[PDB]
Design a protein around this ligand. Structure first.
Ligand SMILES: [Cu+2]
Length: 125
């Protein structure tokens, strides 16, 4: 009921496909940042939304800027998210699996780097 995820100095997560076991009550993502670049150069977060909401979350987050960790304040579309981290930092987020529904498609992504491909799927199993 947990996954360790890395975002590196080249806008890449170490996985592009997460599976959440339907028997989990909560799910935890442990985000870390191998490499050497700080968060005001190559910072990463881990953000979860439906596939349909991803674009809006990204656009509005980029617009909100570094001072808001690249997320729109109180964004109702964001199911769960970590803070923005630089190399050597770490952050975890836990959310209730009840927030995910059968038949929906979910995406995870780093909001400042989603346009550069830093995204992947999240699926119940
Ligand atoms: Cu990033």
């Amino acid at each position: 009921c947990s996954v360790d995820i890395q975002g590196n100095d080249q806008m890449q997560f170490n996985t592009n496909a997460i599976t959440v076991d339907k028997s989990c009550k909560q799910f935890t993502v442990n985000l870390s940042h191998p490499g050497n670049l700080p968060k005001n150069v190559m910072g990463h977060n881990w953000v979860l939304s439906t596939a349909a909401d991803m674009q809006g979350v990204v656009t509005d987050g980029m617009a909100s800027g570094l001072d808001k960790d690249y997320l729109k304040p109180d964004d109702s579309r964001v199911i769960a998210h970590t803070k923005l981290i630089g190399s050597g930092e770490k952050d975890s987020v836990t959310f209730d699996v009840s927030k995910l529904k059968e038949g929906e498609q979910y995406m995870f992504f780093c909001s400042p780097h989603q346009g550069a491909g830093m995204k992947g799927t999240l699926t119940l199993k």
